Ligand binder design. Sequence first.
Ligand code: HEM
Length: 152
Amino acid sequence: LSEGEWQLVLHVWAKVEADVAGHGQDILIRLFKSHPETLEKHDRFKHLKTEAEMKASEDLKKAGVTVLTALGAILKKKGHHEAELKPLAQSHATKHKIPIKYLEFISEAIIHVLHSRHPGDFGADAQGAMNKALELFRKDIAAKYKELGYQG
Ligand code: HEM
């Protein structure tokens, strides 16, 4: 990415950082409504049925913060993220078994929620920069998955 593209990514991300849990809820709810098979991966809360149940769930709220905390740390490295990807790839490839296509699905949900919440900070320039950042994440985590023997 260019330095300007990185700055656009980090600009909108600072808006996420104002309420990380609420953004995480919205992104996971979007993911699970759009791609219900992904909910099955979360044993603690895979039985949730309605949007209201999802919003009330403490476990789902914790999960959203876990994801966004880790992704924010990755984005702030501006591509220089091998050390942060290493433990993530280890668990996601060998324990949770999250295929790349699920990482595509959550990327779509992140983009949807950022555009819904922050359109004036998420125009075409910024959306393209975030798309590039999230594609770089997925490309590099895929390479690390294969190093670990996982072809997902
Ligand atoms: C931006 C993408 C993602 C990030 C940064 C992320 C990050 C994290 C982190 C930091 C943890 C806790 C430590 C660990 O187990 O490694 C975790 C756990 C987990 N992740 Fe992810 N993750 C992402 C995408 C996903 C997706 C798309 C799924 C499912 C479709 C998923 C399923 C899980 C599961 C099942 C756990 C174990 C805990 C639980 O059941 O809530 N991850 N992830």
